[PDB]
Amino acid sequence: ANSRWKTSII
Amino acid sequence: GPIRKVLLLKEDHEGLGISITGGKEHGVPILISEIHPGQPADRCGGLHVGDAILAVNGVNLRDTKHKEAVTILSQQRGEIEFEVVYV
């Protein structure tokens, strides 16, 4: 996937 | 979709059990991108991939930057009320 947007596991 | 209120219960040894993406700097809401199996969000039943998190325990998250949302969300303990919407 793109992944321009930040992702966090919480 | 309709704005929903969803209760999540968790103990202090676990996280929320979600991955979030987006935030103000990306021009989109804080969005649930993953619900991790067997963790509190999965167990609560009412949170799903694609839900935008509008507020948690009354704290608005609609104009929050990604990391701001991480801090706010990770601070919440015990019985946690989410305001969410699927769109």
Numbering used by the authors:
A (entry chain C): 1 to 10
B (entry chain A): 284 to 370
Give verbatim excerpts from the published study on this entry.
In previous work, we have investigated the binding preferences of a PDZ domain that is known to interact with the C-terminus of the cystic fibrosis transmembrane conductance regulator (CFTR). The CFTR-associated ligand (CAL) controls the apical membrane half-life of CFTR and is a validated therapeutic target for the disease cystic fibrosis. We have previously described a peptide array-based approach that enabled us to design a selective inhibitor for the CAL PDZ (CALP) domain. The result was iCAL36, a decameric peptide with sequence ANSRWPTSII.
In order to test which positions can accommodate a modified lysine residue without a substantial loss in peptide binding affinity, we substituted residues at the P−1, P−3, P−4, and P−5 positions of the iCAL36 peptide. Each substituted lysine was capped with an acetyl group, to more closely mimic the electrostatic character that would be present following modification with an organic acid (here: acetic acid). Consistent with our SubAna data, modifications at the P−1 and P−4 positions yielded the highest affinities, comparable to or slightly better than the affinity of the template sequence. The structures of CALP bound to each of the substituted peptides were determined by X-ray crystallography, for comparison with the structure in complex with iCAL36. The refined structures reveal similar peptide conformations in the binding cleft. Indeed, alignment of the structures of our acetylated complexes reveals different stereochemical environments for each substituted position. For example, a P−4 acetylated lysine interacts with the CALP α2 helix, whereas a P−1 or P−3 acetylated lysine faces the opposite side of the peptide binding cleft, and a P−5 acetylated lysine can access either side of the interaction pocket. Furthermore, the electrostatic potential surface of CALP reveals that the site interacting with the P−4 acetylated lysine residue (S−4) is positive. Relative to iCAL36, there is little change in affinity for the P−4-substituted peptide, and the P−3- and P−5-substituted peptides are the weakest ligands.
